Design a protein around this ligand. Structure first.
Ligand code: CQM
Ligand code: CQM
Ligand code: CL
Ligand code: CL
Ligand code: CL
Ligand code: CL
Ligand code: CL
Ligand code: MG
Ligand code: MG
Ligand code: MG
Lengths: 267, 268, 267
């Protein structure tokens, strides 16, 4: 499954609403068909049914199953067997074992508890892992907290800390890195801010919970006109330089040039 | 010991000031009698005596002993053997071994050095551990630094980093989580900001160094009437919804409803 | 001995021997660079310069190329015919990479996700005498495009790695070196970074231009106000036992340690 080839705009779609699968697919780069928290306990069997009977392109679809050790997950895997879906998202991911027990599937580990943050490197390193995501809301919920963001809307420190932990663990083992959802759907400004930053630090994906968010996300992962203009400027300049040199008041060498090239590629 | 159901307002009181033990207990939800940095080396023997002579409710009292590998700690423990106290706070906690050697006692590990932060998971996992606290000042001290906060009062990055490290380590192992003391006694504004935020992210306790701070802390761990109203509205709303649903412009699913219920618990 | 020298350390590409003397005079320690400051085609010339224009080995570090690279092998061959005993290892990612540089002392430059994840093991390695972090390769290797946000602060993942390296170094009694300030003429920003670095116990701020050295050296010396407080509170402490209130603050041992650290940095 060529996840890196697909866009940065992924979308959660509750699996007990098969009448929306087609549109989610159309609006998003990758759809995450959700059997976990997006669907009530009593609608999960129906959700599983909808999953076998309403196929989306398995090359552009991931299924979030239920957490390790839950009876629900067992049901999910049985139902999954009647689909073409090769990639699953494991919520409350908390150990390498939880990932290993899903072989031979590809696994996107969703770290959203303190235990998962503590075990991030082991989780990322596990052989089936193809990506890591973080979730601020279960994180806060399982910490015994009540709020992931402060007054002004900025993530509180522990959420910011887990975000970095996941980005690092993912990158250290060559895994996709997926940034967290933006629950305030009409906060397009906040979303744009997060998604631009995500792209800047090397996240590959920002996950969305509403289709109106996908265009914002796609736009944000395209380098700004200003940044792109600089990239061309500094690269042209370096053609005439050997090793370190000063450009526009800044010391420039290898990795700075790599940043500019990455910007060009992203466009 | 039912520490988790004690209240979030803990108060340090140096153990060489027994005449102040009573005020301490009256003011706070839990008192930490201190044999370590709160008490000069020459006064520690008197503090060990005061420990025995002026007993407090052992259900609402923890004793901070001295660090592992010190002559002081050995005497602290000898003195504790003659008390009712079963829960100790271990300063400069730096390894699981330092916690384990304290069994069968319950141990709150106070991580306040780079080594302890680096071993936070191992320390939290140790069997006798029932809680984790962090300390910014010994952290900066042992780092070779000179201030834990920048000009505007915010903690410097390495301190904010260790705070999160300790919250996650504690919570990964089901331990109590205690937030760092607020040393600016007169800065009630900052204490309020910290305690509200601590409450928001799941710290169970904000440790105080002055009784005047306890009310500030207590008020901070109770959600706004505004947050409560919201919690009641979204929970009522969810009763007629299946799974994820949009509410007042927000996407709402399981953990959001948990947040709401947590508000209602911290309150009613 | 490196640990005895000032906090002002200066990179100088080793293909610029005519600059060596000025760098040595301007800075406490000089880091002669064989890696990213020098174009590949210029590396052999840089190695010759390293051999032909020596600096005081007690005040000089050589940054070699990364573990496993053909360049590093050539670097070490060149170095055998020098008096240099401390090297900086870029893209430091394991204890093993440090250990193979024995019997030299090693400053591990952590600047990749893998390096951040393995920071404690790298710091603990026997040859390690210090740790540095590199914001630009960190971002480059994460697949990102900028280490700093619009307001100039480092992005979170950079700030996160900064503390990781500081803690790892300190946990194992290693020197801690803060990242270069690429904006040469931005002495205001450099001052802010260095004052903060000194405050949290970094031992060195690395510079990329001689003009930055004075700024770093001043920032690592406490202000007159801070020095006055330090003398004040230490005086006050002798009349006090254990914890006591001083100027609105609670004071005990570690606060007095901070004071003494200010004094030491002042003479
Ligand atoms: C700062 C001090 C010395 C000033 O004490 P004061 O008497 O000079 O201040 P005050 O405002 O004049 O006190 C007035 C009233 O408050 C009482 N009072 C005041 N404080 C307390 C108290 N703690 N417990 C019980 N009662 C207290 C006091 O006795 C008096 O009662 P009164 O009106 O009836 O006469 C005092 O507040 C105190 O001792 N606080 C706690 C000190 C302590 O325990 N420090 C160790 C923990 S902090 C630490 O080590 C960091 C960490 C984590 O380790 C790391 O970051 O590295
Ligand atoms: C940027 C450059 C090329 C501008 O060079 P320039 O000639 O254009 O600058 P200048 O202002 O005109 O220089 C004025 C005078 O100072 C001198 N000078 C100026 N710089 C130095 C120096 N470093 N050492 C010794 N002398 C220096 C220079 O020779 C000249 O002498 P003069 O008065 O006789 O005319 C120059 O400053 C330089 O080479 N700086 C260091 C470059 C370097 O080593 N970069 C590698 C480390 S940064 C890195 O890789 C990232 C990291 C951590 O790995 C990751 O974040 O990933
Ligand atoms: Cl299918
Ligand atoms: Cl494995
Ligand atoms: Cl003393
Ligand atoms: Cl090149
Ligand atoms: Cl200063
Ligand atoms: Mg979740
Ligand atoms: Mg302390
Ligand atoms: Mg580099």
């Amino acid at each position: 499954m060529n996840l890196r080839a697909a866009g940065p705009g992924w979308l959660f779609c509750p699996a007990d609403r098969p009448e929306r699968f087609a549109k989610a697919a159309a609006a998003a780069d990758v759809v995450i068909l959700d059997l976990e928290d997006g669907v009530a306990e009593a609608q999960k069997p129906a959700a599983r049914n909808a999953l076998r009977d309403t196929p989306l392109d398995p090359e552009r679809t991931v299924v979030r199953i239920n957490a390790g050790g839950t009876a629900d997950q067992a049901r999910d895997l049985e139902a999954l067997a009647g689909t073409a879906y090769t990639t699953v998202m494991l919520p409350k991911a908390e150990s390498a074992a939880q990932v290993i027990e899903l072989a031979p599937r590809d696994v996107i580990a969703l770290v959203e508890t303190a235990r998962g943050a503590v075990c991030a490197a082991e989780i990322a390193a596990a052989d089936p892992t193809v990506g890591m995501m973080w979730g601020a809301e279960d994180l806060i919920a399982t910490l015994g907290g009540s709020s992931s963001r402060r007054a002004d809307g900025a993530y509180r420190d522990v959420a910011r800390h887990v975000r970095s932990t996941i980005l690092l663990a993912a990158s250290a083992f060559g895994r996709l890195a997926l940034d967290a959802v933006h629950l305030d759907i009409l906060d397009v400004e906040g979303l744009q801010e997060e998604a631009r930053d995500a792209a800047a630090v090397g996240f590959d994906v920002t996950v969305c919970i509403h289709p109106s968010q996908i265009p914002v996300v796609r736009k944000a992962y395209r380098p700004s006109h200003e940044k792109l203009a600089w990239a061309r400027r500094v690269l042209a300049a370096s053609r005439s330089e050997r090793g370190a040199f000063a450009f526009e008041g800044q010391m420039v060498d290898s990795p700075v040039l790599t940043h500019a090239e990455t910007m060009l590629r992203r466009a």
